[PDB]
């Protein structure tokens, strides 16, 4: 029944930084609360319980403290492998989850474009992929060109966690065409757009070279 | 720790049953300082708590009002290990199920925070069929990158390795996304080497459990 709201939603933070999350419940309870840090693909993993206990192995950067109906987890020095969503819990309720991005400096993607297997084209659809490698910040502008054409409503992009190590991400654009589509065009070009660029990047082939 | 693995299958027809079983090892599913939880999680929801089961001078459950009527949680002490069962299912049931042991030793009490934690188990409530997918290679450019895309199957998930699990380094496989065909695709990629293209092979190995699909794909420059 009790319910608990965590504040900020999100942020992002340099290695370094001292981070405040806080956590708020909507009545005093009995119960004890305990932290949780969640990493991509992973089961939430156990960090502080009765507001202040560290669990065993966990480094000492990470703190709990409060009272009553609010409470805080403090992390001294945010580390490279701190990206996670962090979660309170009181009784049996989950708070909101907090995100945490670490902020590090410009990376520039490495771009790779990808022409369809011919495999695949044998069963009817052409597969074109653009990869942006080990970039920061997320955003990026990924524009498909076909004979100079701008492409719209046919691509899906798909991005990867921040990395836990160098902090950067990675991007994934696919153009996908029928068979018949793709063989009427020559030049298949990806144009990637991003902070970390002076200029945009280009990679291309021509279909059948 | 205590080891907490997770079986069961993760596609469910809209009405009909979930059933998830959690195998312990490392203590008793009758400990009278232990109790059994199963959570589930999903972007809408959050992690939400369903249910627990723990032995004190008998069995006890207690369940969430938001399943209310529609949870099982059974123990079967000889095989140590405690399931979900969740009837009725509905797409609001569609998640990421965890079975979760509860109980912490402080100030000479147990509080009941979860410790330990099975590996997950997507469950996907839907009326369509299992589809394995193809797998097609991203052939490096004639310092390196290359991949598999991995394109049409149903559901998820699919897991990718590289070189039968030797290759860790510099991979990136990519969340799936769902086509409007409702299939999903997904690419894994690894950048290696320019000199290691002609002596290294690589190899992408595809399993797809819920078709029982199973594909390896060498990856290489393409020829002409």
């Known amino acids: 029944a009790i319910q608990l709201t965590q504040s900020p939603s999100s942020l992002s933070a340099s290695v370094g930084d001292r981070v405040t999350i806080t956590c708020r419940a909507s009545?005093?309870?009995?119960?004890?609360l305990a932290w949780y840090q969640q990493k991509p693909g992973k089961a939430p993993k156990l960090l502080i319980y009765a507001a202040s206990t560290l669990q065993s192995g966990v480094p000492s950067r990470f703190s709990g403290s409060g009272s009553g109906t609010d409470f805080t987890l403090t992390i001294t020095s945010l580390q490279p492998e701190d990206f996670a969503t962090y979660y309170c819990?009181?009784?049996?309720?989950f708070g909101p989850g907090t995100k945490v991005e670490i902020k590090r400096t410009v990376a520039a993607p490495s771009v790779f474009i990808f022409p369809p297997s011919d495999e695949q084209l044998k069963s009817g659809t052409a597969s074109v992929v653009c990869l942006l490698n080990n970039f920061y910040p997320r955003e990026a502008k990924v524009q498909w060109k076909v004979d100079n054409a701008l492409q719209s409503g046919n691509s899906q992009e798909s991005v990867t966690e921040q990395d836990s190590k160098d902090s950067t991400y990675s991007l994934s654009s696919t153009l996908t065409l029928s068979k018949a589509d793709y063989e009427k065009h020559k030049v298949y070009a990806c144009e990637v757009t991003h902070q970390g660029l002076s200029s945009p990047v280009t990679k291309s082939f021509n279909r059948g070279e | 720790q205590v080891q907490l693995q997770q079986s069961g299958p993760g596609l469910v027809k809209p009405s009909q049953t979930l059933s998830l079983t959690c195998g312990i090892s490392?203590?008793?599913?009758?400990?009278?300082?232990?109790?059994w939880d199963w959570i589930r999680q999903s972007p809408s929801r959050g992690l939400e708590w369903l249910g627990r089961?723990?032995?004190?001078?008998?069995?006890?459950?207690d369940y969430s009002e938001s399943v209310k009527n529609r949870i099982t949680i059974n123990a079967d002490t000889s095989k140590n290990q405690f399931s979900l069962q969740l009837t009725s299912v509905t797409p609001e049931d569609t998640a990421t199920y965890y079975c979760?042991?509860?109980?912490?030793?402080?100030?000479?009490?147990?509080?009941?925070?979860?410790?330990?934690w099975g590996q997950g188990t997507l469950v996907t409530v839907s009326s369509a069929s299992t589809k394995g997918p193809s797998v097609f290679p991203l052939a490096p450019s004639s310092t390196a990158a290359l991949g598999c895309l991995v394109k049409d199957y149903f559901p998820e998930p699919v897991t990718v390795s590289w070189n039968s699990g030797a290759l860790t380094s510099g991979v990136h496989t990519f969340p799936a996304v769902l086509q409007s065909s409702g299939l999903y695709s997904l690419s894994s990629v690894v950048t290696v080497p320019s000199s290691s293209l002609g002596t290294q092979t690589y190899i992408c190995n595809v399993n797809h459990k819920p078709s029982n699909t199973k594909v390896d794909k060498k990856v290489e420059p393409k020829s002409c």
């Open positions: 490392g203590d008793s599913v009758s400990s009278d300082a232990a109790a």
């Open positions: 979760a042991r509860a109980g912490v030793r402080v100030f000479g009490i147990i509080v009941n925070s979860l410790d330990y």
């Open positions: 089961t723990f032995y004190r001078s008998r069995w006890h459950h």
């Open positions: 819990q009181l009784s049996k309720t």
């Open positions: 009545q005093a309870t009995s119960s004890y």
